[PDB]
């Protein structure tokens, strides 16, 4: 079998803007079986007044709450019409908000009924000047949260509490139970002279605590391959040494190509299969 349950598509604002057609076609060539198309939610207008940094990570985040009705028709064409190649998972990557949970909560009590999937991610952690982008680009990343933290070992740590923060989250029904790429605090670790060689023991100790707490959920984990194909990244979303801990405790993965454009379709997912080795 072979599954992807991370995709985006021409409804993000920061995506490639190929159209979703295309991606599933693209999924169907490479012999993709279950494919899940889990776009971007929108964000709190409330949040979004209290962000710092730069504005392009909030603007072009995601779609706006008036698209939703047309991202729904869209997908639902699209899973129909290739039900015969291909089990399309329609949802959101849900973006988990700090100090916003009653919107997040709202939201999925809402659409939650017209999703079949879904991805809970931490992309914004409080920083210089308010909430801020832990994915925008390598010197928003420094000036916004590493400095603010007091280093990437600082940022490390705080990124890892807001992740757990997500797993405990009471979120109502609906809430995603794949938490995606855990360890987003390493894309742009090159920049920082920093690799996932050497994890300090107090991370290390935070990511123990928080697979325990995944297994205890229930919950599985987003194999997120996008870093492999990002600059100052270069690794997987989280690396082997997680992924064997979280082997070692029975949590699922599920691969997650994270892909905006036909061109991501099935990449790393070689790497993938054998990282699960
Ligand atoms: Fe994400
Ligand atoms: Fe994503
Ligand atoms: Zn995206």
């Known amino acids: 079998m ?14 490639t803007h190929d159209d979703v057609e295309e991606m599933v076609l693209k999924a169907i060539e490479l012999d993709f079986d279950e494919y899940s198309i889990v776009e971007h ?16 990570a909030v603007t072009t985040a995601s779609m706006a709450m008036s698209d939703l009705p047309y991202y729904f028709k869209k997908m ?5 019409k290739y039900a015969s190649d291909l089990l399309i998972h329609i949802g959101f990557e849900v973006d988990y908000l700090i100090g916003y949970e009653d919107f997040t909560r709202d939201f999925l009590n809402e659409y939650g009924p017209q999703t079949d999937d879904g991805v809970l991610s931490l992309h914004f952690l409080e920083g210089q000047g308010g909430f801020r982008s832990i994915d925008f680009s390598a010197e928003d990343y420094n000036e ?17 509490e807001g992740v757990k ?3 405990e989250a009471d979120l109502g029904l609906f809430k995603p139970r794949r938490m995606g790429h855990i360890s987003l605090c390493q894309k742009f670790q090159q920049f920082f002279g920093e690799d996932t060689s050497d994890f300090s023991e107090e ?4 990511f123990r605590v928080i697979l ?9 984990l987003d194999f997120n391959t996008a870093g492999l194909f990002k600059p100052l990244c270069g690794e997987t979303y989280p690396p082997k040494k997680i992924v064997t801990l979280a082997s070692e405790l029975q949590i699922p ?11 991501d379709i099935g990449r790393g997912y070689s790497t993938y299969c054998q990282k699960l080795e």
């Open 144 to 160: 916004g949260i590493v400095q603010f933290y007091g280093g990437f070992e600082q940022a490390q740590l705080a990124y890892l």
């Open 76 to 80: 639902n064409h699209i899973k129909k």
């Open 203 to 206: 991370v290390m100790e935070k």
């Open 2 to 15: 072979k599954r992807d349950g991370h995709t985006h598509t021409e409804f993000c604002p920061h995506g």
């Open 212 to 220: 325990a707490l995944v297994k205890k959920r229930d919950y599985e």
């Open 253 to 263: 993965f599920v691969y997650g190509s994270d892909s905006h454009g036909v061109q």
């Open 41 to 56: 939610a929108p964000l709190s207008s409330e949040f979004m007044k209290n962000t710092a940094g730069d504005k392009e």
């Open 165 to 167: 923060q997500s797993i």
